[PDB]
């Protein structure tokens, strides 16, 4: 980070809203009658299937950020939430795996 | 005031009961830290 040279882990695979844009373009091409790269169409279908998974990952990132904000606020009582932190570390290990 | 200290301690005890209901992490350590802080406050009160 800027002023924090340590690698702040954006812990998640590459998420691009352009995938959603391509899915919308595919739906529009279905609506408007255009032949297209059906390999890309199948990839967009798989991406649409995994889009809820991407949303879950984004929500998990938001939850991690909220936990980080809470920790930054109450570092003085971060030990008070030691059990939740341990559960979160276990979940982080599972998600990394 | 002795009654004022009793009221403050009653608030502290209610908070302790709430924390026990919380089921958070590091409960005995937090209790010890709170006891030490109360000791510091009481030491100021004792100097007074």
């Amino acid at each position: 980070v800027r002023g924090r040279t340590g690698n702040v882990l954006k812990l998640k695979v590459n998420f691009l809203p352009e995938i959603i844009t391509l899915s919308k373009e595919v739906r529009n091409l279905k609506w408007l009658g255009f032949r297209v790269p059906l390999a890309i169409v199948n990839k967009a279908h798989q991406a649409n299937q995994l889009y809820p998974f991407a949303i879950s990952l984004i929500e998990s990132v938001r939850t991690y950020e909220r936990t980080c904000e809470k920790v930054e606020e109450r570092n003085t009582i971060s030990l008070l939430v030691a059990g939740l932190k341990k559960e979160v570390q276990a979940l982080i290990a599972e998600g990394i795996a | 005031d002795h009654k004022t200290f009793s009221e403050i301690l009653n608030r502290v005890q209610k908070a302790v009961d709430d924390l026990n209901l919380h089921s958070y992490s590091n409960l005995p350590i937090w209790v010890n830290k709170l006891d030490m802080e109360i000791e510091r406050i009481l030491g100021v009160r004792l100097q007074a």
């Binding site: 980080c68 982080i92 795996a97 | 992490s25 590091n26 409960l27 005995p28």
Partner: peptide
């Protein structure tokens, strides 16, 4: 009475979590 001795209940630090996670990513 065997007072306390509650294993020093504390979790891995978030920076320590970041370190272990970077280690895993290197292993990944």
């Amino acid at each position: 009475r065997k007072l306390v001795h509650d294993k020093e209940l504390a979790a891995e630090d978030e920076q320590v979590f970041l370190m272990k996670q970077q280690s895993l990513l290197a292993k990944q």
